[PDB]
Structure formats: structure tokens, C-alpha cells
Amino acid sequence: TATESYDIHIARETAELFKSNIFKLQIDELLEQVKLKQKHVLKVEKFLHKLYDILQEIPDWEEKSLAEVDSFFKNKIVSVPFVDPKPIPQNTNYKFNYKKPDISLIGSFALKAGIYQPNGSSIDTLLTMPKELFEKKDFLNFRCLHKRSVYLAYLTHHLLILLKKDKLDSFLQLEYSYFDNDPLLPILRISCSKDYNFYKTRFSINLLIGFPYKVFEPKKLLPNRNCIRILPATPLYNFSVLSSSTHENYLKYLYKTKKQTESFVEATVLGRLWLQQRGFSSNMSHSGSLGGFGTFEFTILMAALLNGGGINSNKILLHGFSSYQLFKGVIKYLATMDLCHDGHLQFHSNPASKYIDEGFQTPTLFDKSTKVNILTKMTVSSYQILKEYAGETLRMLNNVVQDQFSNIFLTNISRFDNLKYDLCYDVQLPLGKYNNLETSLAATFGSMERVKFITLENFLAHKITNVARYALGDRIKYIQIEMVGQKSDFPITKRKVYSNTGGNHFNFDFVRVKLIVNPSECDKLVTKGPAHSETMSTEAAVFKNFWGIKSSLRRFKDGSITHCCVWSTSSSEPIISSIVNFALQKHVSKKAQISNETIKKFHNFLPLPNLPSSAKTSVLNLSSFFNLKKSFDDLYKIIFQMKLPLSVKSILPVGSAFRYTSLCQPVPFAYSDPDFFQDVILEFETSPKWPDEITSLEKAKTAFLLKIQEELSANSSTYRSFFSRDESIPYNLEIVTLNILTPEGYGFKFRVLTERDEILYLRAIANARNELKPELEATFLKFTAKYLASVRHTRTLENISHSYQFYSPVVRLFKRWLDTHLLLGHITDELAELIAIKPFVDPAPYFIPGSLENGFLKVLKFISQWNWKDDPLILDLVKPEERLTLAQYKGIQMNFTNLRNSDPNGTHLQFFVASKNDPSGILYSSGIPLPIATRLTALAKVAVNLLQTHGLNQQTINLLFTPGLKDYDFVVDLRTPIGLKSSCGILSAPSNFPENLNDLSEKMDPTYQLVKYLNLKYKNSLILSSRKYIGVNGGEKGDKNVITGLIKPLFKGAHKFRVNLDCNVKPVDDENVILNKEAIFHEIAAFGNDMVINFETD
Amino acid sequence: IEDISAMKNGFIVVPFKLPDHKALPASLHFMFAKRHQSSNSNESDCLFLVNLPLLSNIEHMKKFVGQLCGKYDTVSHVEELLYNDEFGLHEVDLSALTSPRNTALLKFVDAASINNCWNALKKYSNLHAKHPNELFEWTYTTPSFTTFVNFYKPLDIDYLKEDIHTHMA
């Protein structure tokens, strides 16, 4: 009913209003920003008018034999752009002629939907050859196309004459190209160099040669029909021929729809930009490009959805929809309504559009009026990717919290293949000439293939796609084959695009195979094939032939026996690399050379643990961490079950190993590793007997640890234990940890937490004089991070890591990178972890990372673009579709803006990083010196720039992990007397704990303590940085460290002598003093003494 | 600069020659000293010292005062170095709250000891100008490998047990 409909409509409007209104204003602004100025439209319309005159003056010539046209052109500059197969005298009875064309405009310019493009835009001018130039059999065997090419050539010759005459040839540029990069459809392109000069408008003019509507029986050109007699259907060929007859038809259809629908043009601009950012266009995708779906296809789809589109032909879009509603509705349809394997859309350009739930296994948008499949230019692989981008955009459009406009329209994700995709393989294919293919190509490219695929390039891209898809199975989600160096333009003096690059005579330099990985399956040992039975099924025969020597039979745990291939894991590369190499060399070309060295370099920058079969262990394998947890679990039981004066309530392990983030994988007995001792929080049942002052409280806690240690030593003597001071909570001098060494070779440090602790820190803040409150706040923050927030941080990251399998190795590599640049000492592990998770929990408009390279580069890219003065980082630490609500998100944003009100430049707090775990945004990022924050940003920019400039390769990757050590006041080289690489558990093996536990210390980093105490002494005046992981980053033996020093800007000039200056100073007169550099240098040299090898000063 | 023996606020300038290090290319460290005024009983006969050299301790300060006594044939006995918290570890009394950085006091055994030292320091402060080579070298305590790794060692269990057992009684 009308009232029912109205109520639903109002309910929906209200539900969508918040985002709808915001989006509209953003849309309005974008459209103004990209608006074509009327002066430019008018200026090209002036040239277009002259062009029409000139063209109208080209005289008809005469019916000519192929011999005659050949003679006509032989002596002239212009060549006929005959398509392959070019006509031979022996097989061409018909003849050729030119007569005056009907001129018309098509495309965006004709629909007045043009936008300002820095790169420029094309105006498509349609020149229809008269019907009498055609015989009704001309749709067959390239006849109409050869007629078309001569027609274009004759036109181009006479146009050149007439342009010379009007003096226009001095600023005009003429060249051949292919319409939509379709090699069957050469066109002429006119462009301007620096009154009819339209250079400043950024337009180019394409002269499209078309056929009259319905010159050939449309039913004879259906996708399932053959039109090249050699029979196999010729859908590619048929599309080129049939659509050459429908250009005006579609312009009329789109113009009519535009007139009916107020926001059509605006929605068209939104579609164009959305597709453009994602690397899509109308260009032919069959020859190794991402596309077949550009502005034209978007508008045709939108128009179809404005006249039905449901499974029962119901309207999807209404004529009164805002541009937001139109765009969103098209995206939603693309996301959810399958047009390839499971269905297709039928429409009538001349009646209601109907979704039909049978698929043709190729992208299909079928016009019942014209018999054209609008989506012919799209490969299956291009369509699958389009549908995923549509799904992601639909999710973004439904986000009622974080603003997605920039992600949707304003972010080019296509600039860098290594960010857009997870793995990219460069494939050299020196196939030689066409006559060489019998040996250079493993598959036959014969008569049937040429008829179906038209070009070798189409055949080759499809072959490589099909081979890689079958070989990789569920290891991947999406694939693109790219013909790199492919050209679309060629001189008017040439028949076609010619190439001799890449050791071949085809239109590409090499091929790039680009993958979106499936992390749950990508590095599995077994490629599963068909079931084994008595006689070979077709599927099993195919599998066996495809894999050859790699194929075997295997019994699975469930009792099944199937054909399979078994691969070897490697720490250095994904199994995918082996498979691509094997499959391409076997089934594409024996001459194929496959390389992907970038992924190996990133893999090899993760420290290799000294564990059995380490070099053969997947980067995705977490066994090291699982084995540590298993050891902990055994100890947990013993302590939890102990009879003590209070019962144990909780034992909560909170160390980096429990959330898979430790820089090095844990190795038994590797006690040199900074992360060897894993923190555990121990809580007893509540008790009113805990002391009400911090010294007595800590001693009471220690008394319980003593009882635990006593019981452990008595009845569980394969565990060893000792007590250690924790000096990291400033001014709490009595904290003791119980350090337990398990028989499996792992270390755990236990601290007690009571319900009294937080109360005492809060009381200390309340009691402190105003001047001191900041220091007590900082102490309380350190306490909170260690004892309170560590449990939720660890539980959250452990849990969601299962949905983000590449996060663990990515964050570990990120920490390694931070430590190589001496930053890790100032950046908490939690802050590093939360920055690194950004590309995983908030990937848009990219996909979630599916390789080590992809994730790591995304973290650096994020940092490079993060203006931490202006913007917070707010994370929804959840698995992919508990999320922050609108109110919660705005409340966190207000924490940031409040902070910036009194800290507008981020002098006190730079990186605001918040989540549901920490809405304050400052728990893990407080107390960082400003120069350290700026250096981190600077290094990320340096990294991104190095890669944009010099590309991603072995040399530039090495540079990412090399410190520059420039712009420092001083640099000190240290060497420890004993190398720690081995005892850190890194392969360049620890086997026991020392007899005397006092000797654990002999394999610990003395330079860590050195730098710790230097920072404590000189906190007021200097910033000192060093490596935290000497085993990892201290060279071949793990014995070299560096200290860099910065004098705080506060101490570069003189000051009044005051008793509380807290700086090593010298007098400059009897009233004023200045920092004394020479004395400080001698102090530092003396402090490190024999370990100080070199000391450089600015 | 050599002519600056005392600062305007009453602090005497007390320079030391810095020992050589293999890794560095005769520089001075400047400590500052003034007589301490305190109505507090345990802060009697003290010099307030600003900018003590790295890792200053009672042994180093006794050596210094002894060199002064030898040079100027005088008698001065040092009792204690007070409030030398070079690493800032005791800057806030968390214990009290839950119920002068880079400076210290050098305490002498009696009024005569400090007076003698103070007179000797006055003459010491004029050496920079008159006889710079007569300034005393400060030889830093130089922590060994063992000293740095000691920070990692277990707490002594028997000391700990005793400490905890007694405090809890």
C-alpha cells in the first residue's frame, strides 16, 4: 500500500540521514572541485565545429580493389591500419570505398558529464559509414573491419591535406590508436601542442568510425554465434562488429535516461572517480589489464537499474534518487548481484530490466534490444576484483561512524602494485616472433584459438591467468595478469602497434602476475586434488597431467586418499613462489623467467630462530610461541593449585609471546633475548589485610611470592627460580618479581596485583603538591600499562591475530625496523603494536594485508602520511565483518581535541593512539621526546620516497634497515666483550641454564644498562638512543651498539646560573652558564670506558 | 673565563681536569660550592655542591679534600655525602605520598673541618687563572662489564627473606 511504502521510505530516510547529509555536502564540494569550466567546453566546441566542416569537404572517391588501395597508399605518408589478419588478394573478392559520414558525438562530452582531468580527457566523435558501403555478408570474416580501416585511412589522408591548408597542422598532433584498446578498432586521435588551438582545455579528439544501426542482422552477431569461418563461437569479434553499430543507440538511451533522472550526471562523475582510483577503465582487459568496466559501463548499468533490475523486474533505482542514492545503489548491485558464474542482467535499450539467475561463466550485461553483451571487454578476473571492491565500498557506505568519503573517492590505490596486491611476480617471456611460437609457447596458438582470442596477447593473458588459477587454487583470492609496456598508440605511417621489446615481437615487455592472497590457505603444505578411485575420473586425469612429477597420492588424517602435491615451506619465500615458477614454465613457456626477489628480502629481515628446521618453516608458523605457551600452561596448573594463605584467583600472562609480537621468536634457553622473561600478573582472592601504604604493600606481595617459590623449590624442582627487582615504575622501589625458568627452557616473571594498588597510586597523585602531580601521574600511567591494561591489550591482540595472520610477522619486522633506527627504546612495544595493526583493522580502501611485504609497506606508508598534530589514530580492535559507537568515537575525538587545546603542536604528546581498550589515547605514547616522534615520521617519509623514486628492490630494501646516523650532536660506537647473537636464539644453539643463576647475567647486554642509566642521569638535557636488540642488530656476532645524542633545544644557549638547572654546565661569566659539551663527552666515554670504541662529535 | 673564581650568587667555581679517553681527541669539569645554611640538625657543617662529576661518591670526595689538605697544608675531615641522587631514583617519596637535582651536601665532621676546606677552596678557585696545570684531575670511577651485568643478577634470597620476614612482623 501507498501508506506502507511511505512509512518504510520515511523510516529508511531517517536511518540514513546522518551519513546521507554529510555525504551530500562532500559530493557538492568534490563536484565543484572537478567541474569543467564552460569556457573550455565552448573552446573545443569551436574546434569541433571547424572539424565537422573540414570532414564534410572530404570528397567521395571510388570503389577500389585491394590492389588499387595498396597502390593508392604505397606512395603516401599514411598507412592503412589493417587489423590482423590483414587482407590478401587471393581471399578478398569485395572492394573498398569512402563516402561522406554522418557525424555525431558520444560519451561523457555528449552527455555533458565531463570533468576537469589533469591528464586530460577524450571527446569521442562518431563517424558513421553510409549503409550502401556494405554488403549484408560484411559482418563475416573481417570484411566490414577491413572496409572500416581503409575508410579511416582515406579520411586520415584527406584530413591531413585540409589541415595543412588551414595552417592548423602546426599545433595539431595526429596518431592512430585503438578505441577502448580494441585492436579490431583503430581510430584517429587529434591532440594539441603548446583561435582553434584547444591545448589549455586538456581535450583530445577521437575519430571513431562506426557502422549504421542494424546494417548486419543482430541475431547473427550474438555471443554464441561464429562470424569467422575457418565452428567455435566468436564473442570477442562479434562484440567489436556489433557494438560499432550501436554507439548512437547507447547515446540516445543514456540521454533519455539523463533527462528522466535529475542526479544522473552527478552519479556518473562519482562512478568515474570511484573506478579511476581503483585502476578500472572501459579498455579491453583481455590483453592483460584491469578493466572492461569504465564510465560508459557504469552509466549503462545505472540506466538499466533505473528501469528494473530485480529478479522479478522491480526497479532498483528511482528517477528522483540523490546522486548518493544512485551511486550507493549501483555499488550495492555490483557487490551483491552476480553477473558472471551465477547470473546475469538483462535489459532493453529500446522492456523492464531483469536479473536472471543463470550465469554464462563470463561477465554479462545483456541488451535484448541490440544483442550486445555490454560487459564483453571484462575478464572473469577483472569482474571478480570489481565485485570485491564494490563489496568493500558498500561496507564503507554503511559505516555510520568513521568518515569514508576520502577512502571512497579521493585515494588512488593503483599507483603502487606492492600496496594494491600481496605478491607480484615479474615474468620474462622471450617468445620471439609469431613463427617461433611452436617451440616458445607450450600451448598451441592455431586457427581455432585465433578465431576465439583474436590476438596472441589475449590468448597469452588468458592462458597465464588460467594456469596460475588452477595451480594456486584456494591459496589466492584474486589474480591479475598485466602485460607491462603494452602500447595503444601508433603513427599514421604504421599499420599497427609494433614491438621488439622483451625478447619478443608482441605488444608487451614482460608479464606481471599480481595476487591477492588467502592467508588461511596460502602456505599450506598440500595442494589437494581429486579423490582417488578405481578408474581415473576426468578431474583426476587433468590433475595428474597438470602436475606431472609433482602429483602423488596421500592419506589424510580423516582416512581419505586423494591425488595431491606436497610442497616445502621456507622461511625465505611463500610456497606460492615455487608454484608460479613450476606452473608457468611447464604450461606457458619453457622460456619463462619468473622473479620475486622483494618478498625474499623482507622475509630475510625477520630474525631466523635457532630451532630445528627453522629455514624450512613458514613465516606464518607460530609453533615457537605455542611451545612457550604450552610450557607456561604446565606451570600455571602447579601455582594455581598451591595451598597458600590466600587462594590464587588469576594468573594472567601478559608478555609479548602471548600475543605473538616478540621481535625474535622465543627459543628454549635463549636468555640473552630482551623478551626472554615473559610478564605474568598474579592476583589472589580479595583481602582486607593488605597494607595501606606502598612499601608495606609491596613487601606483603613479596611475602606471598616467597611462599610460592618455597613450594615450587620443594616439590617442583625441575623449575628453577630467583627474585628480581623491577625498577621500571618510577619511585616504587620495592617491587619484586619471581622469575621462573621452566624445564622447557622458557622464562616467566610473576608480579602480584592487589585491589589496593590502584588506590595507593591515586592517593599519591591526590597528596602530591601541584608541582609534583605530573610526575605522580606519569608513575601511575606506567603502573596502569604494566599491571592493569596489559591483560586486555594481550587478550585483544591474541584473539584478533587469528583473523589477521600476517599481523604477527609484520609487527615483528616493524619492531626490527624501529630498532635498526634506534627508536624502539623510546617507543613502547604496545605503541609499535597498535601502529602496526592499523592496516589490518582499518585497511580501506586497500585490502587486509596478505603478505609480509604488503603489511610492512602499509605500516610505513601510514606513518608517512599521518599528521599527528592534526589527527588522532583511533582503532577498532576487532576481527573483520564491539565496534565503537558514534558517541564513543566522538568522545575519543574530543579527548584528542581537548589535549591539543593545551598542546597544539604536539610538543608534549605527539601520537594519540586510542581504542576501546584505551580511550585516553595516551597510555602507550606519553613521555616521548618530540625529536624522536619527528624522526620516526621523517624516516617513514624517507622510506616511502626511496621506494617511489628508485623502486622496490634488494638495494632499496637494504637501505630501509640502514641507520643514517646524521643530524646528531654526537655518535658513540660500542662493542660488548661477548657477542650475543647465538645466546639470543638467532641463527647466523642454547641448551641449558647455568649452574649458578648469577651467571645468567654474563650473557646479558651490558650496553642496555649503560644507556638506561645515561638516560636517567641526563634526562633533563640530552636525548640518547641505542639499539635494544644487540643480538639482532649488532652485526655478525651481535656485539656492536651505537649511542646517538641530541642536546635538547632548551640547552643550546646560555642561561642564568640556578641551583636547579640540572645540567653539566660551565660558566660564561659570573652570572650565566652554558652546557659543557667536553665534560659530558668525557663522562659518557668514562661511563662506557672499554666498551666505547669511537666517539664522533658535531 | 679563567678569571671566574666565584659566581655572583656566592658559589665558588671548582674545576677539575678531565682524564683522557682513547676515543676522544685538557678539558675541565666545573663543580660549584657554597656553605650550606640549615636549621636542620643533621645538615650541620655542610657544603652545598652543584654539578658533581659523574659517579661522585664519598671516597672520591675524601680524595679531593685530602689533595686540598696536602696542597694547602691544612686539616679537614669529611663525614658524609648527602642527597647524591645522580640518577633521580629517589626524587619523589612515593611511600610518604601513599600513606636540587644534580646537587648534594658534603658533610664535614666539625666546624673546623669545613672552615679549613672552604678556605682551601677559595685558593683552589683562583688556580684556573694563576696555575691551570695545578688543577686536580678527576678520575672517574669506570664501571666494568661485571658492574653493568650485575644489574641483571638475582636478589640475594637470604637478605630478601630477612627483610620481608622482619618488616611483616
Author numbering:
A (entry chain A): 81 to 274, 282 to 317, 326 to 445, 453 to 983, 1010 to 1116, 1128 to 1237
B (entry chain B): 3 to 27, 32 to 105, 120 to 189
What does the study report here?
The full-length proteins of yeast Utp22 and Rrp7 were coexpressed using recombinant baculoviruses in insect cells and then copurified and cocrystallized. N-terminal residues 1–80 of Utp22, C-terminal residues 190–297 of Rrp7, and several internal loops of each protein were not visible in the crystal structure, likely due to structural flexibility. Utp22 and Rrp7 form a 1∶1 dimer that adopts a saddle-like structure with approximate dimensions of 137 Å×66 Å×69 Å. The N-terminal half (N-half) and C-terminal half (C-half) of Utp22 are structurally similar to each other and are arranged in tandem along the longest dimension. Rrp7 binds at the C-half of Utp22, forming a raised end. The structure of Utp22 can be divided into eight domains (D1 though D8). Both the N-half (D1–D4, residues 81–689) and C-half (D5–D8, residues 699–1237) are structurally similar to class I CCA-adding enzyme in all four individual domains. Utp22 is likewise an intramolecular dimer composed of two copies of CCA-adding enzyme modules. In addition, several structural elements in D1 and D5, including the loop between β5 and α6, the N-terminal part of α6, α20, and the N-terminal part of α21 would occlude the RNA-binding paths in both halves of Utp22 and prevent access of substrate tRNA to the active site. These structural observations indicate that Utp22 is inactive as a CCA-adding enzyme. The NTD adopts a two-layered α/β fold, which is similar to the fold of RRM according to DALI search (best z-score = 4.8). The NTD and linker region of Rrp7 associate with D6, D7, and D8 of Utp22 through an extensive interface, which buries 3,116 Å2 of solvent accessible surface area per subunit.
